[PDB]
Design a protein around this ligand. Structure first.
Ligand SMILES: Cc1cc(CC(=O)N2C[C@H](O)C[C@H]2C(=O)NCc2ccc(-c3ccccc3)cc2)on1
Lengths: 86, 141, 103
């Protein structure tokens, strides 16, 4: 029901399993807990926000808002996103 | 992948339900994308088109793809009375594409090479989304 | 209406949603179900302000405008009861500099 995603710096994010199964990487990594040796907290929190956003807004006519990214975070987010495949 | 030249007039309303300046794009009888005037966010426009013609919408600055009535293309149907309603909306972008969008929109493309990230990402940043590209993509179905 | 939250304690952060109309006490059931520890052994906060069990999350300040999927509101969580620990939330890691490429 929930899984735990731990960031490079130790913070722990507890998230619904299907939210997490957004990422094929994670799918494979679990299958429970998963450590992310290279993803700092300010990145992996954004990622979880996008999971919650994705599950919310996919398959909806109910007008969708822009997922925001601060510039400071853009690069690291790009790198995590490319790894996690999502 | 072209419009049908039916000459059966059709009235449409393009509503831009998106934070982006929208660029409407009609596909010609041959197949060339024809661009039309742009729609600021929230704004609407009443439109004269025709049954069986092809439309698709994009961000006008960056050519990011957008959805119309939940799908990729828009074909004015039997008009029945009353103008046909075309809702223009953000998709749920992948988080990767989304990141590309932001990074593209901050850096000058000259300086992409000077970003310390893998090389494959450098290629992806340059592979800008675009009509002709997507029409090739969309065509194969 | 769904509200979307980050329930936070120390280096623990839970992502969950809930009805605007469910109770602070009901949120504690949910935490209990996740962190395996009873509602009496836990206190909840918005910012610094301690929340009452029978108030709804709406009444407590968590609303659609305010607790969006892409920008969930934070609920502070505290533990232990023969004495309550003080509300404490480890901040997130800092982003680097910013590349001078950024007008
Ligand atoms: C016969 C015949 C002629 C044509 C070519 C044509 O008149 N078209 C092609 C498309 O179906 C639309 C239609 C057209 O150009 N109508 C005039 C027009 C002018 C401006 C707009 C417009 C769109 C977005 C924003 C602000 C203006 C739309 C339609 O198609 N069948």
């Amino acid at each position: 029901m929930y899984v735990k995603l731990i960031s490079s710096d130790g913070h722990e994010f507890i998230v619904k399993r299907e939210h997490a199964l957004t990422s094929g990487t994670i799918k494979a990594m679990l299958s429970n807990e998963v450590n992310f040796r290279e993803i700092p907290s300010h990145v992996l929190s954004k990622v979880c926000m996008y999971f919650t956003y994705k599950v919310r807004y996919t398959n909806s006519s109910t007008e969708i808002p822009e997922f925001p990214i601060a510039p400071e975070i853009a690069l690291e987010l790009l790198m995590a996103a490319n790894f996690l495949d999502c | 992948l072209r419009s049908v030249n039916s000459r059966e007039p059709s009235q449409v309303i393009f509503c831009n339900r998106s934070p982006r300046v929208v660029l409407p794009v009609w596909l010609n009888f041959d197949g060339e994308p024809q661009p039309y005037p742009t729609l600021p966010p929230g704004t609407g426009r009443r439109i004269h088109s025709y049954r069986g013609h092809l439309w698709l919408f994009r961000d006008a600055g960056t050519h990011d793809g957008l959805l119309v009535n939940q799908t990729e293309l828009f074909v004015p149907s039997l008009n029945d009375g009353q103008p046909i309603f075309a809702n223009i909306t953000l998709p749920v972008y992948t988080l990767k594409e989304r990141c590309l969008q932001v990074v593209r929109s901050l850096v000058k493309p000259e300086n992409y090479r000077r970003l310390d990230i893998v090389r494959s990402l450098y290629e992806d940043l340059e592979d800008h989304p675009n009509v002709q590209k997507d029409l090739e993509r969309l065509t194969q179905e | 209406m769904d509200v979307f939250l980050m329930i936070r304690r120390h280096k623990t952060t839970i992502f969950t949603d809930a009805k605007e109309s469910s109770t602070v006490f009901e949120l504690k059931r949910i935490v209990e179900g996740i962190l395996k520890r009873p509602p009496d052994e836990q206190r909840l906060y918005k910012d610094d302000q301690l929340l009452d069990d029978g108030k709804t999350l709406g009444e407590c300040g968590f609303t659609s405008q305010t607790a969006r999927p892409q920008a969930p509101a934070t609920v502070g969580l505290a533990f232990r009861a023969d004495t309550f620990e003080a509300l404490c939330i480890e901040p997130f890691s800092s982003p680097p500099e910013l590349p001078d490429v950024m007008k």
